[PDB]
Write a protein that binds this ligand. Structure first.
Ligand SMILES: Cc1cc2nc3c(=O)[nH]c(=O)nc-3n(C[C@H](O)[C@H](O)[C@H](O)COP(=O)(O)O)c2cc1C
Ligand SMILES: Cc1cc2nc3c(=O)[nH]c(=O)nc-3n(C[C@H](O)[C@H](O)[C@H](O)COP(=O)(O)O)c2cc1C
Ligand SMILES: O=C(O)c1[nH]c(=O)[nH]c(=O)c1CCc1cc2ccccc2c2ccccc12
Ligand SMILES: O=C(O)c1[nH]c(=O)[nH]c(=O)c1CCc1cc2ccccc2c2ccccc12
Lengths: 313, 313
């Protein structure tokens, strides 16, 4: 019985990794994720320049999940590129580097410089599309013309396999259109579904107040709120992108949640809110829990059930 | 202390009602809602002709909420019109009638016939904009040009105050666009936020199967999963539509949840999943619980706190 995966020319001890943004901002964070039982790690989505992010409180968690409007606080691309090129121990596990430029040109400038490091050290790029465009326009992955532009220019500038982090969609016509856009790009080898469910609002009944300060309390939702949304997105893209991998993200707190992701089509399984709340010891628990489900069902490897969710009649 | 209120030229005993589609399809259901302690009731969204809906199982509930792909089973407009015209006891509470025609012409046809019954009896129209659209296109409320057409045509055809049932949005630019469309229509006097969160996917780990039959297991989510999404949509429209009322729907299981809807801006509070699960006795529990929170806080009226959610700094 084993959780090993071999994909994108790397080997992974198990499918678990952090979700971008959680336990991955500082060198300390990245060393901690490297020391953990996770099968891989992803660095915080970065911009060319360092960012302080939004005012606090900007993240809160609760029994059913979390809300955040962090505002992309990060140490800047030069720091993450240095961690990839000089500090990360690739004998421990593979590294993904996520970027989230504020314009197409900013993303192009970073992927041009990542390319040689990607080729020589094997760091893998995750482009965050679930992210700001021009203010007053929807985030980039909700604007399919901007998404196509971004992917064309990054493909040309990078020239190497990469993947994309996608927001959730809610309408079949959107699943169809988004998968079609992605399928125009052969260098997009994985698709991570999903980023946070956007612009939720948590209100505290005692204080009669929202719980985060930015954006009048509005922010992205993660955790138990979003598992069925996450599963739908994973499966929708799994069915529509037969030449790409899908990584699952959203609502994983247990090996059974990871099992459902994998049944939906997930290759790698990322952990955001639950990891923020529990800490990196979650990875040993998730592994043990998933292996237990596999033993009860007689499954020896992940491929025996990945994408094999049954439908009715 | 009572929770009585006046809206849209009608008096309501309390702000609670069923959500369209729950306990309101048959004459029996409508009589049971009328006999309940709810403040109002809404009939099942209807088409011109009766529909059997999708194959079963088509609804499933779980501790965190529900998933459905009912396929609009309903008795047909003629039946709900007859109920509004001849069978509903208006001395007991107000009645809303929900229409969900498959095209703009179908909706125009039903509203021209509804108009004289609305004038004579005071039945209120709720137009469901989660209805079907043209080839390769999203639901109507996710196509702002189709939305504007629908609202232009219904407004012209009906000529009386009405409301609209909206799907959730997840992007601030979308809140801005959708609110601006609605604000073009002075006859749109209430906006109900929100319909189910579209195209989620629930998977049972034991059976490795989806739990509903239609659409490969994909369906709309309600209940606890959707509360912060519903609060966000309520508050976004409350802020952007100052000359309309907002009706809140999504994730109400308790008087505390209702309190949060009202703080966000809700005038009426609709109950879907929790009503399907608990039955019409829920309405006395909700009233008691809301009155108890008001008493502890020192609030004597709903107006004292409606829309008064506090932001940080
Ligand atoms: C505090 C916080 C920061 C985040 N920052 C990023 C980010 O920088 N880049 C990104 O792709 N996703 C970011 N996310 C989204 C997560 O990667 C993930 O998609 C989301 O939280 C859903 O997974 P979960 O339900 O396990 O939380 C962030 C989430 C949280 C909670
Ligand atoms: C079984 C079922 C049938 C529904 N049918 C309709 C409908 O006919 N029209 C409509 O506007 N919304 C309909 N809905 C959506 C609800 O009115 C409501 O917007 C949604 O369930 C979210 O509220 P909740 O969290 O209380 O369930 C239906 C929901 C369920 C669960
Ligand atoms: O940093 C975040 O807020 C964030 N949180 C998530 O849940 N997922 C994400 O992908 C991100 C980053 C995307 C992003 C999200 C933002 C949300 C609210 C306000 C600002 C931003 C922002 C600003 C600059 C660059 C990126 C962002
Ligand atoms: O009847 C529903 O499935 C339904 N469920 C909800 O959660 N909200 C709704 O608004 C509806 C009705 C909207 C709707 C929803 C549908 C979902 C799957 C397949 C068909 C329909 C459909 C067909 C004709 C007219 C309306 C529909």
């Amino acid at each position: 019985m084993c959780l090993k995966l071999n994909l994108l020319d790397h080997v992974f001890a198990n499918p678990f990794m952090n979700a971008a943004g959680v336990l991955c901002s500082t060198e300390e964070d990245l060393r901690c994720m490297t020391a953990s039982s996770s099968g891989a790690l992803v660095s915080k989505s970065c911009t060319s320049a360092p960012r302080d992010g939004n005012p606090e409180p900007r993240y809160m968690a609760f029994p059913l999940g979390s809300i955040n409007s962090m505002g992309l606080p990060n140490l800047g691309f030069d720091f993450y590129l240095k961690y990839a090129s000089d500090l990360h121990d690739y004998s421990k596990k593979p590294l993904f580097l996520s970027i989230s430029g504020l314009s197409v040109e900013e993303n192009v400038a970073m992927v041009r410089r990542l390319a040689p490091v990607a080729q020589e050290k094997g760091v893998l790029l995750e482009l965050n599309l679930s992210c700001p465009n021009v203010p007053g326009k929807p985030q980039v992955a909700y604007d399919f013309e901007a998404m196509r532009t971004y992917l064309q220019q990054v493909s040309l500038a990078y020239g190497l396999p990469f993947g994309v982090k996608m927001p959730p969609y809610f309408d079949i016509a959107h699943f169809d259109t988004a998968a079609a856009v992605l399928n125009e790009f052969p260098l997009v080898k994985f698709v991570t579904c999903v980023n946070s469910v956007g612009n939720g609002l948590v209100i505290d009944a005692e204080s009669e107040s929202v719980v985060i300060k930015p954006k009048q309390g509005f922010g992205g939702l993660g955790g138990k709120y979003i598992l069925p949304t996450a599963l739908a997105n994973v499966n929708a893209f799994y069915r529509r992108c037969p030449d790409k991998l899908v990584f699952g993200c959203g609502g994983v707190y247990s090996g059974e949640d990871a099992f459902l992701h994998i049944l939906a089509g997930a290759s790698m399984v990322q952990v955001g809110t639950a990891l923020q709340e529990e800490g990196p010891g979650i990875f040993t628990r998730l592994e043990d829990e998933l292996l237990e489900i596999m033993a009860r069902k007689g499954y020896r490897t992940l491929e025996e059930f990945r994408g094999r969710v049954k439908t009715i009649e």
